[PDB]
């Protein structure tokens with residue numbers, strides 16, 4: 157189990173670690189988070205008590221380095237940093253553990269929620285979407301725009317998701333205009349899967365990462381990406397049967413985890429009704445359709 | 457965006473544009489089968505593509521053979537329309553290609569946008585105007601060439617005949633839409649108005665009779681009355 161120690165907590169802040177959230181008061185004796193499961197990516201995120209505007213956070217993998225958080229009073233935010241001195245890092249984390257200055261990651265041995273939300277998410281792919289190569293962790297916040305949003309502004313601070321556009325020359329073969337627009341299998345299977353993502357695991361990884369940035373940061377461009385990647389599958393008549401079964405599981409856990417009170421803003425009525433009730437795959441997402449109909453029957 | 461009452465004069469500026477109406481592309485007769493079920497028999501149709509400034513009507517005749525062995529023909533017809541419009545544009549010299557294509561029904565937007573992805577600078581637009589172009593098949597010479605076609609064919613007519621030698625395109629388009637609206641509301645009456653006087657003939661390359669300016673005023677009045685009439689007969693007013 158790994159640890160994200162904190163130099164201090166000088167400003168009052170809600171801290172979130174994956175699907176969990178807790179409050180820290182200004183100058184409270186808080187020195188970080190312990191017992192973090194090894195083997196998964198994680199995200200540690202922040203909303204200041206005095207300006208709930210800008211949620212921000214860091215995607216990281218404790219296998220890739222020793223990381224800690226220190227508030228920066230000039231830039232006004234909690235920053236993730238890397239300590240190369242392993243000896244020094246362990247010596248400090250031990251002092252905090254002895255003084256019980258850390259809160260415990262609460263993993264409960266029946267719960268696979270976080271695994272099920274991050275199964276295909278890999279830190280190497282996150283770092284290609286979020287370009288900042290000098291760090292091993294990746295910063296994301298509420299306001300960051302996507303490369304496609306910048307096409308429809310700072311390129312360095314963008315989310316480089318894979319561009320999906322159904323009315324584009326890439327999506328449409330000359331001479332198959334109607335066929336390719338009404339059945340997107342070519343675009344999914346040959347252009348995206350074989351050509352760009354290489355396998356369905358990398359596709360699902362980007363889809364999962366997009367959902368989580370939308371949920372944790374209210375990142376609008378990520379929400380658009382999440383829905384586009386769903387709609388591409390649902391609008392394809394020919395999809396590997398294992399991809400459909402896996403998609404049903406992915407979406408089930410995403411819908412299960414979503415705050416009920418955010419459903420209005422994080423779920424696109426048009427995409428979901430099309431996918432569950434009109435699309436080629438309308439009968440293929442049994443788990444997802446059942447949870448959607450029992451939890452958000454308004455949207456449908 | 458959408459063409460409407462507020463931006464009506466844009467139709468008559470010097471930016472090339474075409475209207476595209478697909479309402480006569482897929483046409484059928486419905487009849488009873490020997491077993492007493494119902495079947496359709498398709499008949500020839502046409503795409504109505506019109507430059508409202510010049511009167512240039514590029515009439516693409518849709519022969520029934522294009523439907524053979526095809527499913528979901530009402531949906532195919534929109535994509536076939538878009539395919540033919542795309543082909544027409546590509547066949548024109550660059551300086552004759554339209555800057556805008558206005559579709560009379562919103563269901564043509566996506567099919568045409570998709571067929572025109574190679575032309576990002578051509579704007580595809582809907583309209584809030586209720587234009588009566590479906591009545592194009594009430595013009596005898598257009599109906600004749602469509603029903604006689606034995607194969608796909610493109611035919612060219614100036615839908616304004618020689619009117620632009622004497623009136624502006626705004627006025628010519630207003631006359632055309634009045635004539636078409638009348639023919640759509642009561643074809644028999646409309647055609648009696650247009651043809652009753654045997655001394656006014658239709659020239660061999662023209663579609664409409666050779667009315668004098670004064671006769672057009674009378675005809676135009678008669679067409680308004682007809683439309684008002686039918687509006688009463690219809691609504692009991």
Ligand SMILES: CN(CCC(N)=O)Cc1ccccc1Br
Nearest residue numbers: 161162163224239244245248249
């Ligand atoms: C403040 N600390 C540095 C102490 C020093 N070098 O004098 C920051 C930090 C680094 C490493 C481990 C935990 C943490 Br918290």
Ligand SMILES: CN(CCC(N)=O)Cc1ccccc1Br
Nearest residue numbers: 173176177178189259260261262
């Ligand atoms: C413990 N609480 C929710 C845990 C739960 N029962 O789901 C907030 C929390 C999350 C993570 C670490 C410390 C703390 Br405090």
Ligand SMILES: CN(CCC(N)=O)Cc1ccccc1Br
Nearest residue numbers: 511512513514611612613614615
């Ligand atoms: C006279 N020419 C066409 C007649 C023909 N068949 O050659 C001009 C013209 C160009 C394009 C469309 C309609 C029209 Br009318």
